[PDB]
Amino acid sequence: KETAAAKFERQHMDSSTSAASSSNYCNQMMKSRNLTKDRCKPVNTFVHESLADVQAVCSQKNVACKNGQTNCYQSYSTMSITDCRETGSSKYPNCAYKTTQANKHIIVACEGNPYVPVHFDASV
């Protein structure tokens, strides 16, 4: 019975590397976090900041979500992240990804009580 909050941590939190993602980081992470079990999740971002810092974004700059909902929040500070994008030759169940490190502001959707991140919307 994985909560939405728990799912966000599994899909998007990676506080352990401080940001040193190898060219194979996404290939390994997308697999270890069970994001290529049913299919190849096209794109996914991992955040290498502390959990408290990412949770704090829910009290930061309120912005519109891409889907039009109003519960998205942009971090005031830039954060260490890694973007994973499926390559053009990626073939299930052998999903392949391009790993790209960056330092950008994250935009997350928040829900619940406590009010915590439940979806990763974008980086800017």
Ligand X SMILES: Nc1ncnc2c1ncn2[C@@H]1O[C@H](COP(=O)(O)O)[C@@H](O)[C@H]1OP(=O)(O)O
The binding site for ligand X (CB under 6 A) comprises 11, 67, 119-121
Question: Are 45 and 79 spatial neighbours (Cβ–Cβ below 8 Å)?
Answer: no
Task: Transcribe 8-56 into DSSP letters.
Answer: HHHHHB-TTSSS---TTHHHHHHHHTTSSSSS--SEEEEE-S-HHHHHH
Select which of 8, 12, 58, 110 is catalytic: 12
The residue number whose beta carbon is nearest to ligand X equals 119
Select which of 84, 97, 119, 123 is catalytic: 119
Residue holding tokens 């810092």? 53
Spatial separation of the C-alpha atoms in residues 75 and 78, rounded to whole Å: 7
Q: Is 31 annotated as a binding residue?
A: no
Our CB check for ligand X shows the closer of 18 and 67 to be 67
Question: Are 44 and 12 spatial neighbours (Cβ–Cβ below 8 Å)?
Answer: yes
Would residue 12 show up in a list of annotated catalytic residues for this protein?
Answer: yes
Would residue 119 show up in a list of annotated catalytic residues for this protein?
Answer: yes
Q: Is 99 annotated as a binding residue?
A: no
Our CB check for ligand X shows the closer of 25 and 120 to be 120
Q: Is 61 annotated as a binding residue?
A: no
Our CB check for ligand X shows the closer of 83 and 121 to be 121
Known binding-site residue numbers:
7, 10, 41-45, 66, 85
Active site residues: 12, 119
